[PDB]
Amino acid sequence: TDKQKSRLWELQRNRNFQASRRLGGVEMPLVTLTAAEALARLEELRSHY
Amino acid sequence: DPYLYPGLDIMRNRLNIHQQQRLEQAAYEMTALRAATIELGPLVRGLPHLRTIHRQLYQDIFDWAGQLREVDIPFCHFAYIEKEGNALMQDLEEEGYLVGLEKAKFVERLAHYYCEINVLHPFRVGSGLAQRIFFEQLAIHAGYQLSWQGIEKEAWNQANQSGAMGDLTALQMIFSKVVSE
């Protein structure tokens, strides 16, 4: 169940974050990226500001 | 308000952005991508873990990410947040993190713990976000899962407003739709 729990987390967490943010009134795109892809994108966004 | 830059009405931030619209955009984008790297975390979880979640979300935007609110800006006076948050979390521990509950009891206790942490308002910014991640994760450790998909902004607020006043009925109704499996 501990690997079953982690995999369920990974598959829902971004969908959640989008809908949690929409609770506070803001529509952002869904993040479809994997963790490592999102980490690379963070360093790109830091360069841009 | 020590969170602001000296001259301005903008929050001091690590990107040194001095325009309101831009800071909001970059904060939405960077938080979104940080959330996509947050891992489930431990069953045994308290104030430290909530803080850990908020550090991960906001580390690119704020030097104080992961620290408890230091001004008053109903919500707990800032200097008592740690005391009452640890007290709250010790109680969650005593109920084994809500693990092993039938749906209706789970919904009833989740509503209670959500309402109490929310009123505590432990972070200067980003409390609701860090909070809902903590309970998404707690729910999964207890055999359940949360989805915020159908929920209108205005109902969510009203239901939290009456919950802070001692009537958990509207937050309970919302949670019986948000909880499943």
Residue numbers in the entry:
A (entry chain B): 5 to 53
B (entry chain A): 10 to 82, 88 to 195
What does the paper say about this structure?
The E.coli Fic protein EcFicT forms a tight complex with its cognate antitoxin EcFicA. According to this classification, EcFicT belongs to class I with the inhibitory helix provided by EcFicA, a small protein coded immediately upstream of the ecficT gene.
For EcFicT in complex with the antitoxin mutant EcFicAE28G, crystals of the monoclinic space group C2 were obtained that diffracted to 2.4 Å, containing three toxin-antitoxin complexes per asymmetric unit. Strikingly, mutation of the putative inhibitory glutamate residue E28 (EcFicAE28G) decreases the melting temperature of the complex by 10°C compared to the wild-type complex. EcFicTAE28G crystallized in the space group C2 with three complexes per asymmetric unit. The structure of this mutant is virtually identical to that of EcFicTG55RA, except for disorder of residues 83–86 at the tip of the flap. Despite distinct crystal packings, the structures of EcFicTG55RA and EcFicTAE28G are virtually identical (root mean square deviation (rmsd) of 0.59 Å for 232 Cα-atoms). In particular, the interactions formed between the Fic protein and the antitoxin are the same, giving confidence that they are physiological and also occur in solution. The Ramachandran angles of R55 (Φ, Ψ = -120.7, -160.4) are virtually the same as those of the G55 wild-type residue (Φ, Ψ = -133.6, -155.8 as measured in the EcFicTAE28G structure). Though the side-chain truncation in EcFicAE28G increases the size of the putative substrate binding site, it may not be sufficient to allow productive substrate binding and relieve the inhibition of EcFicT. Because of the hydrophobic pocket on the left-hand side of the active site that may accommodate a different substrate, de-binding of EcFicA or more drastic mutations may be required to allow ligand binding.
